Design a protein around this ligand. Structure first.
Ligand code: NA
Ligand code: NA
Ligand code: NA
Ligand SMILES: [Zn+2]
Length: 866
């Protein structure tokens, strides 16, 4: 359809203040009654345009009078000649069972449940579906007692009743005005885990976690995590929960990961259910993350919400920042930072090049569900971290405070949040605001000079953002640029300028500038962009010895990891160019020596050693190139792994045996050691075949937990070892009746370095555990093929592109949101060689031709083809 523009936001002509919903539930045909209290603010001649999608309108009343001055248009109900203040009453029917897109009210298994973010409440009743219209909800659900014993909506339960013919009803009331995207409804039969948490001030909150029956044994971690979140937000931000009850329901059929619906979060069951033999350490930490995340939304998203959808980052960048900080306090900050930066550089930077490039606050949007992006979430949070970096904790907290004090109870803008941070701190963020409106990844170039006569070090820093598909015009940003300077012994040299300390975060605000430091008593090795202080590409001409020096001496663990990625980047690029000419991998001795040194340093945190021995992902590697040869990258990763497996075999095995652990515990010291042990196992898989096949299958068979079971299975697949098919069948045989566990197996299948991986993947569309109606299964198999196996996806013959087009033809009609996730590999076409671009362009031109092309796909397809 047509685009919506941020600069066209105007306040609404009408407001709703209270809405009283009734649901006569039935999966075939639900009847919705909505009584809303409205107020005209605009002109008298302005009609009321209510949004609505695939609703069957039964009746319209205005102050109990059957209305005759209205009409239905494309996606709207238009009501005219209205009083200034009035009661609106709509009755409509919807059909949950038919809803395969999982927008609105749909069925997930036997259960009914909702997804309204961003614009799904309009698939339930005619409303002002925009998040600047906030109102007090009352929700009455009626349903078959047998099939739907639990009837849940937002708030507290305020009435209940039984009816003839085996039906019953519950009524719910949320005292906080909210935008309709935060409305939730759930009916079904569940096992319920109940605990309580008591707030800092005495308030006792009931906690109820709803799971499909028989899953009550994978619930406690989720619950413990929720409790930790409530405590952490209390300790770090001073934020207490505001209601008496907190519900979380885990469903299997869900497009997102989870949803901050006020008082009644709905979670993909992926980010709830864990048990030591079904879930890995990553799963546990992700559940901690997502539970936390939705919880933190209770302030940064609900108590203060978004005036319009272009302000999505207001809540998501801030709430992601909050889930990073939660994870980082409770666990390893260094590991957390490293991985979040892997994500920025690997995946986000790629999107900021792509035809979908947008600023964290978009200016144009066709389908809003396309803008739940790495950019809005992860880059959004980096922008928040930058603010935190410029202001410091004490100041940042005062801004949070002023933000809430001003906007609690309303919908706000990104600019409002920045103004709160500015006014509380008296740090000026006028120039900084440009981060909200400029797309693309800036490139910061650093040139250095030491003058021993004067004992001064000059940094010449310059910046440029190259043009993007979405903006022709770019300008310099306010870039917090952190530096440490190290002397010959590995001590930090103090920064100064004329006998006066200088702050180690520099304000790179111009296209080019120059910083001169004094009393620099020795020629420094610098650490640049410490802790990835801005979401930029750094360009500096490191010597390998500067890099290895930093791996040995840098204060900050992140700087050691990052020195290593820079060391290794050089050689990844070398060996890709070599691969392309039929040459074998070449690697200097001293490079392997550095990784050996990390493996044998007793001073090293195992967690860090583990991340330094985790090679960059293929996506992380691709960001190093202008043109991507996915096959060269894939083969080079495989080779580089083999070479270090050989060069480090004795030390790898030593460290593998050293960090054996008889007990399994989800505690961070233990996870660090298990991560390191399994990092060693990966390399060993790629070494001597018999020894490999022995360790891998032994670890798999003997593993007490899924982290170890799967690490070995995954290495058997990755390294193509003898036991593979057997181990792989064993897993199927055991876990096929369990979708979330099978997700891992599908990924392994889909990301196999095998020769006939596409043929296997087409076949797995028939597998017992697979189903095209379940977005988890789709992402696990098809998603992992297209997104995480770029070597097979970008086969020379175009067979990958055609497979995705077949799938997308199905998913376009069934679930556009998921089709849109899946097309992302294909809109990156302008990044590969001509021969590939042509086939990709052809695939996109096929999809453009679809009878009933969704807006979701249409938005991305016309940008890419443009
Ligand atoms: Na209102
Ligand atoms: Na709290
Ligand atoms: Na910590
Ligand atoms: Zn969120």
């Amino acid at each position: 359809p047509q685009a919506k523009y941020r600069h066209d936001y105007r306040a609404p002509d009408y407001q709703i203040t209270d809405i009283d919903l009734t649901f006569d539930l039935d999966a075939q045909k639900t009847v919705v009654t909505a009584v809303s209290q409205a107020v005209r603010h605009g002109a008298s001649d302005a009609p009321l345009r209510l949004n609505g999608e695939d609703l069957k309108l039964v009746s319209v009343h205005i102050n109990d009078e059957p209305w005759t001055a209205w009409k239905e248009e494309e996606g709207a109900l238009v009501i005219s000649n209205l009083p200034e203040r009035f009661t609106l009453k709509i009755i409509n029917e919807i059909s949950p069972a038919a809803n395969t897109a999982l927008e609105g009210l749909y069925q997930s298994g036997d259960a009914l449940c909702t997804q309204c973010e961003a614009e799904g409440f309009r698939h339930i009743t005619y409303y002002l579906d925009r998040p600047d219209v906030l109102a007090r909800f009352t929700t009455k659900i009626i349903a078959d007692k047998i099939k739907y014993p639990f009837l849940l909506s937002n708030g507290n339960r305020v009435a209940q009743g039984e009816l003839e013919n085996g039906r019953h009803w519950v009524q719910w009331q949320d005292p906080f005005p909210k935008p309709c995207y935060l409305f939730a409804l759930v009916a079904g039969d569940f096992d319920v885990l109940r605990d309580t948490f008591t707030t800092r001030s005495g308030r006792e909150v009931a906690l109820e976690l709803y799971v499909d029956r028989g899953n009550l044994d994978r619930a406690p971690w989720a619950m413990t995590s929720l409790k930790n979140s409530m405590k952490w937000d209390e300790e770090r931000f001073g934020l207490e929960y505001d209601l008496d009850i907190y519900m979380i329901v885990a469903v299997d059929f869900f497009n997102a990961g989870a949803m901050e619906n006020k008082g009644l979060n709905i979670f993909n069951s992926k980010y709830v259910l864990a048990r030591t033999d079904t879930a890995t350490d990553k799963d546990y930490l992700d559940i901690e993350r997502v539970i936390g995340h939705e919880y933190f939304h209770n302030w940064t998203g609900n108590r203060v919400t978004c005036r319009d959808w272009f302000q999505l980052s207001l809540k998501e960048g801030l709430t992601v920042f909050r889930d990073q900080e939660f994870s980082s306090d409770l666990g390893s900050r260094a590991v957390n930072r490293i991985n979040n930066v892997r994500t920025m550089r690997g995946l986000q930077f790629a999107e900021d090049a792509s035809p979908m490039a947008h600023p964290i606050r978009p200016d144009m949007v066709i389908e809003m569900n396309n803008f739940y992006t790495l950019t809005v979430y992860e880059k959004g949070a980096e922008v928040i971290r930058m603010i935190h970096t410029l202001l410091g904790e004490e100041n940042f907290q005062k801004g949070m405070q002023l933000y809430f004090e001003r906007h609690d109870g309303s919908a706000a803008t990104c600019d409002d949040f920045v103004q709160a941070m500015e006014d509380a701190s008296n740090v000026d963020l006028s120039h900084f605001r440009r981060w909200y409106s400029q797309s693309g990844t800036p490139i910061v170039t650093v040139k250095d000079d030491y003058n021993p006569e004067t004992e001064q070090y000059t940094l010449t820093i310059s910046q440029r953002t190259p043009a993007t598909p979405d903006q022709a015009e770019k300008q310099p940003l306010h870039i917090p640029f952190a530096i440490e300077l190290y002397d010959n012994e590995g001590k930090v040299i103090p920064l100064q300028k004329g006998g006066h300390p200088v702050n180690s975060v520099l304000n790179v605000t111009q296209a080019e500038q120059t910083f001169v430091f004094d009393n620099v008593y020795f020629q420094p090795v610098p650490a640049l962009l410490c802790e990835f202080s801005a979401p930029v590409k750094l360009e500096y001409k490191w010597s390998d010895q500067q890099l290895t020096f930093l791996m040995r001496h840098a204060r900050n663990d992140f700087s050691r990891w990052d020195a290593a990625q820079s060391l290794l980047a050089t050689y990844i690029k070398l060996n890709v160019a070599r691969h392309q000419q039929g040459q074998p991998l070449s690697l200097p001795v001293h490079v392997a020596d550095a990784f050996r040194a990390v493996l044998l340093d007793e001073k090293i945190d195992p967690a860090l050693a583990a991340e330094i021995l985790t090679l960059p992902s293929v996506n992380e590697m691709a960001e190093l190139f202008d043109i991507i040869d996915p096959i060269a990258i894939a083969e080079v990763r495989e080779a580089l792994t083999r070479t270090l497996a050989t060069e480090l075999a004795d030390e790898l095995l030593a460290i593998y045996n050293a960090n054996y652990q008889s007990e399994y515990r989800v505690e961070h010291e233990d996870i660090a050691k298990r991560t390191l042990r399994n990092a060693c196992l990966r390399f060993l898989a790629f070494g001597e075949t018999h020894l490999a096949d022995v360790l891998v299958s032994k670890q798999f068979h003997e593993a007490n937990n899924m982290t170890d079971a799967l690490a070995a299975l995954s290495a058997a697949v990755a390294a193509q070892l003898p036991c593979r098919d057997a181990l792989m069948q064993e897993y199927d045989d055991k876990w096929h009746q369990n979708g979330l566990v099978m997700d891992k197996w599908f990924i392994l299948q889909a990301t196999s370095p095998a020769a006939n991986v596409l043929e296997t993947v087409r076949g797995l569309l028939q597998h017992r555990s697979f189903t095209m109606s379940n977005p988890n299964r789709i992402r696990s198999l098809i998603g992992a093929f297209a997104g995480s196996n770029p070597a097979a996806f970008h086969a020379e013959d175009g067979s990958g592109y055609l497979f995705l087009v077949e799938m997308l033809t199905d998913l376009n009609s069934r679930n556009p949101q998921v089709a849109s996730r899946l097309i992302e590999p294909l809109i990156r076409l302008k990044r590969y060689d001509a021969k590939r671009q042509e086939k990709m362009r052809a695939a996109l031109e096929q999809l453009k031709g679809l009878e009933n092309l969704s807006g979701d796909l249409y938005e991305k397809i016309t940008k890419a083809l443009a």
